[model samples]
Target: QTIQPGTGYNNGYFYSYWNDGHGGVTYTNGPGGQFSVNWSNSGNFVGGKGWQPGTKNKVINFSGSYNPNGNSYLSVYGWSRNPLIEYYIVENFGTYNPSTGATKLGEVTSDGSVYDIYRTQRVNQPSIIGTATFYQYWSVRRNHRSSGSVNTANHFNAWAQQGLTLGTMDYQIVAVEGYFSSGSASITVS
Candidate 1:
């Protein structure tokens, strides 16, 4: 099973279908207040273990560390399901490169950090199952640190002020995404 790609749900979390080459992530609950993703091999990503979709009026925070053994990233990725399907994320590890020809929307600051934001329209990309035509905002931290509190509302509010319309938050995730061309990663969050 470790040599192949798969999907399932457990412990009240959904491990979504995501992949590319080969490898597996072992989710483990550590002592005290921590959970970790023990990644092995060169592959894509698998996540969706966090708060369920709903309207939230609070500043959510995430603290974590990422040890990249190769070309990989551990990001806070999520989606909105109401008025529109919008994807938002804060990259906590590794480098993020938008797809070829994707639009770069420049940079901004929120939650005590700077981010290089980029947006990708669904219509301009390849299709996937259970996906829709929406906008994906990837907020890559300018500092490249491993741990911090991401004020989720602040990022949305910043973009909203700039004339970007967003739907009600459907679901939010605190997960690690790895794209190891050859090595692996050690991702932890609390």
Candidate 2:
């Protein structure tokens, strides 16, 4: 059983509480101005489901950031409107001795921006994480819209001019923010 405000439920503002299953009552903002009905059980009852006593474990504590597993990465967004643009997660970053093959070179990342030049790994190969490198003087232009066109539609094209070897996996991350610059990249070599 739960207490009612008498007048009934409020959608966005309400104070609430619950038995956290530890013989203690946990109070938080009520939902819809009504406390959710609880089960009439002696054990810890949550949402009508009963659990073992004192079992309050959170599998994951997620916040505003990402928690990737093995060999994964996140790319920054908010650039041009092309959906194909992206970034990658590198298992190995920085200069590395293959101990078996040739040294890879010439990494390129291009959006429909005012810069277009041959790319390099912003950070060296075999990097751990949070490594960043910056470059300058690359020029490229790809616009899907033409003022003279009869039909009005959105268009865009973005890619890098580089020699890529086969059997290599390419990863990209794309997100959107606003009308300005919005795109990010990361790379891995095998």
Candidate 3:
């Protein structure tokens, strides 16, 4: 595939997803191995080489040894990506078994699918709710500047529902930010 810039959420993660038939069985008869792949974090996707462009491909030890009728599965993954991301989600792939896959995916969110979930925090002390906040909330004094006549409470509610935050289920602060913003951050495995 031709490498294009700004077309997806992750910019550097890439891999080929393939299936090797163990001819239907689940063991030794159908085993396979992987070869040259391209990966990048340098902010450029171009004509590097192989199935992955503009990156490095290593020489395979088992050249021409891949069997077509084996039970092996091959999935290539890295951070191949695009322009914008819709939501910030933390998960292993639900399709791939969230808990176990998270261990194998290993911070490879850029290459895999996951659930999109924003979260709320629970404190150790129930009485301390809202006392030590994860962050500050904003209140509009008058009407919303955009609509000019929208109800203050409704606007607040809507923004609250759509607002973004960092870190979930913990009282610790991950980082301080004015609002949701995006560039790129390294993926987290867990």
Candidate 4:
């Protein structure tokens, strides 16, 4: 069966959820993989499986693949609610703008890889709990990568070195974000 919007399910050992207000999204978890349908939407919203959280940490290790089309994004994502910081380590940035309000925070070398960092903020963005402020941190690869590891502790450390303070992480998410796009994404987190 399919899990509806704003609901959670067990994907392997993880608990995942879906969020969709301006469009339709269907989620299914099977032995093979978790899936979403009607994922193409044009509203100022996103639809995907939002995973549960674990204690705060300095590193996030995730890997996934996607068949993306038309403004799709398949990535390892998560956030901290108290300080309202979100992190997106993108895997497939299909039709997504990496330069949206682009502010370069130099580069960070973590887990033996280098990533270009950017930060953006939006007021009153929709949240699963409620309307919330969003401070997003994008740690992007210098080139396209479908799957990889992230030492986010080093990411936070780099930002702190530059005098930028972000709040503590509330949880970690493994999910996808799409706008007017169609596709499938399956991510496994370790």
Clashes of each: 1, 22, 20, 1
lDDT of 3 by residue, 66-119 (tens): 121211111111111121111111111111221221212112112122222222
Winner by lDDT: 4
Could you tell me which residue pairs clash in candidate 1? 53-170
Candidate 1 or 3, higher lDDT? 1
Give per-residue lDDT, candidate 3, residue 113.
27
Candidate 4, superposed: residue stretches over 4 Å from native: 7-12, 21-24, 31-51, 56-64
Q: What is the lDDT of residue 77 in candidate 3?
A: 17
Off by over 4 Å in 3: 1-89, 93-110, 124-161, 166-190
Residue-wise C-alpha lDDT for candidate 1, range 68-170, written one tens digit per residue = 6665655666666544655555564554443336676666787667777667767644333254566676767766655666666666766666565567665
TM-score pick, better of 2 and 4 = 4
The estimated TM-scores of all candidates read: 0.71, 0.18, 0.16, 0.77
Ranking by lDDT: 4, 1, 2, 3
Measured on C-alpha atoms, candidate 1 has an lDDT of 0.55
The alpha-carbon lDDT assigned to residue 109 of candidate 3 equals 15
- Candidate 2 contains a number of clashing pairs equal to 22
Tens digit of lDDT per residue, candidate 2, span 1-190?
3342122123432121223243322212233222222222122211111111101121111112222222212211111112211122111211221111323333233322222222233333222123334221111122211111110011111222233211111211111111111111111100
Tens-place lDDT per residue, model 4, 1-190, is 5655544545543545545466645455544234444455533334344345534343555556666677766555766666677777665577776646689877887665677778887689875457887777777765666566666567667776765566655546556666656666666555
TM-score of 3: 0.16
Q: Arrange candidates, best TM-score first.
A: 4, 1, 2, 3
